[PDB]
């Protein structure tokens, strides 16, 4: 309803309800093909990175990694009601790679645990 | 065993058994344009299924009820007495409403599942 990036200046809570609008707009002479291939590669790297975490097929993915207060010590009210996604993304710079590594390790442990649980007769 | 589109003239309830045959057949400047557009069509279809919460499935059941205004037919005549081409023609220019309803239903389902998983 608000458009492609209309929620960019809205709060994180309000902006979380517009994920499909932005998701649809990520996919749609030599330099035009290079641009198309770059768009496809960025999309596939993001989908692969979600798949590594066990989040494939979902736009909102809950995980088993606890939030560290050293990354951000704001409460949920301040993060979700009084902050935008751009300011939040600035706040968590230098921490996203640690979060990504923890998500990868947690999903590897989740896959091993599910495989062992499914191995019980 | 019928081959690519071999079931195209069969009924919907029979052609629905050959979805993997169709799925497996979806994958110098002109050649790259053809390959990139095939990739883009595949990826748009996969993203559209993902938005609906049907990623990884070929037969995906949803929570959108069927409107009698889209096709006022019973299951027997839809599945046993007509083909997918005739169905696709019959529900032309109704698919965008269905797609919007599927998107909204999946967004509501994701919020409900997140809230259910937020209970201690």
């Amino acid at each position: 309803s608000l458009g492609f990036l209309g929620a960019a200046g809205s709060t994180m809570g309000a902006a979380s309800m517009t994920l499909t609008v932005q998701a649809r707009n990520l996919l749609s002479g030599i330099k035009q093909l290079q641009a198309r291939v770059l768009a496809v590669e960025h999309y596939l790297r993001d989908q692969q990175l979600l798949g590594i975490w066990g989040c494939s097929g979902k736009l909102i993915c809950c995980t088993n990694v606890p939030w560290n207060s050293s990354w951000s010590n704001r409460n949920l009210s301040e993060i979700w009601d009084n902050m935008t996604w751009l300011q939040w993304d600035k706040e968590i710079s230098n921490y996203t790679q640690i979060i990504y590594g923890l998500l990868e390790e947690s999903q590897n442990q989740q896959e091993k645990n599910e495989q062992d649980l499914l191995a019980l007769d | 065993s019928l081959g690519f589109l071999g079931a195209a003239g069969s009924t919907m309830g029979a052609a629905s058994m050959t979805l993997t045959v169709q799925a497996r057949n979806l994958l110098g400047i002109k050649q790259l344009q053809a390959r990139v557009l095939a990739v883009e069509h595949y990826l748009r279809d996969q993203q559209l299924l993902g938005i609906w919460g049907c990623s990884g499935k070929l037969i995906c059941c949803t929570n959108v009820p069927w409107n009698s205004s889209w096709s006022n037919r019973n299951l027997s005549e839809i599945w046993d007495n007509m083909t997918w081409l005739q169905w696709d023609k019959e529900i032309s220019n109704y698919t965008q409403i269905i797609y919007g309803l599927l998107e909204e239903s999946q967004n509501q389902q994701e919020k409900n599942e997140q809230d259910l998983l937020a209970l201690d």
């Epitope: 994180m12 809570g13 979380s16 809950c62 409460n75 949920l76 009210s77 979700w80 | 509501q108 919020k111 409900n112 997140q114 809230d115 259910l116 998983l117 937020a118 209970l119 201690d120």
Partner: antibody
């Protein structure tokens, strides 16, 4: 917050009765809602809970197959439709705010902003 | 469901303790308990929520504690206007959302 019950107060055994809550002093769509039952002389018990968006409902086992809880964020209205009421359901039914929150809100798991209570008697 | 004594008593100015004992799966497992003050004829008011938190509008005379499967409320100084039936409530998971105890007559 002037949460006021406008429901009925006399039903026969085996009949149905609808209760409702109106809110004015707070953002209705921002809080979860619940119904809590107080039988005379027996204390209070929780009966039903609905989420802030209305998509999720929860019940005690004793009413799971009989009561339907719903809400309308437009007009700030909570409704509870009780079918097949039993003699054990004679009680004061209070509206309550909270008892649940979404994943993006802080935890509550407590009831606040109680209504004044509708008296439902089953003959 | 939740065990609470039927009444307490004390003189004005004294510290009065009310306690509720539950089970391991609700008070022991979760830190989400609450205490309500219901005057006869009136709706209950929220007095304590979670663990020793007070909502806005409640004076600091009401406190509490949690240990094991037992939760308690403490009134630091009894007043004539405190006479009411006090109730416990606790979260008990997703299958049984809330468990309430009986009423305690303050008997000022």
């Amino acid at each position: 917050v002037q949460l006021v019950e406008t429901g009925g107060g006399l039903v026969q055994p085996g009949g149905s009765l609808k209760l409702s809550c109106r809110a004015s002093g707070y953002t209705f769509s921002s809080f979860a809602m619940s119904w809590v039952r107080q039988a005379p002389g027996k204390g209070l018990e929780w009966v039903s809970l609905i989420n802030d968006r209305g998509g999720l409902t929860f019940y005690v086992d004793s009413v799971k197959g009989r009561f339907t809880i719903s809400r309308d964020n437009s007009k700030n209205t909570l409704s509870l439709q009780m079918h097949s009421l039993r003699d054990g359901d004679t009680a004061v039914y209070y509206c309550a705010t909270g008892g649940m929150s979404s994943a993006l809100q802080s935890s509550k798991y407590y009831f606040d902003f109680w209504g004044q209570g509708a008296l439902v008697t089953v003959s | 469901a939740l065990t609470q004594p039927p009444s307490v008593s004390g003189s004005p100015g004294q510290s009065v303790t009310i306690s509720c004992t539950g089970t391991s799966s609700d008070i022991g497992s979760y830190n989400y308990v609450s205490w309500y003050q219901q005057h006869p004829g009136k709706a209950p008011k929220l007095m304590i929520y979670d663990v020793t938190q007070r909502p806005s509008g409640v004076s600091d005379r009401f406190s509490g504690s949690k240990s094991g499967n037992t939760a308690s409320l403490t009134i630091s100084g009894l007043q004539a206007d405190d006479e009411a039936d006090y109730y416990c409530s606790a979260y008990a998971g997703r299958q049984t959302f809330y468990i309430f105890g009986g009423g305690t007559r303050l008997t000022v």
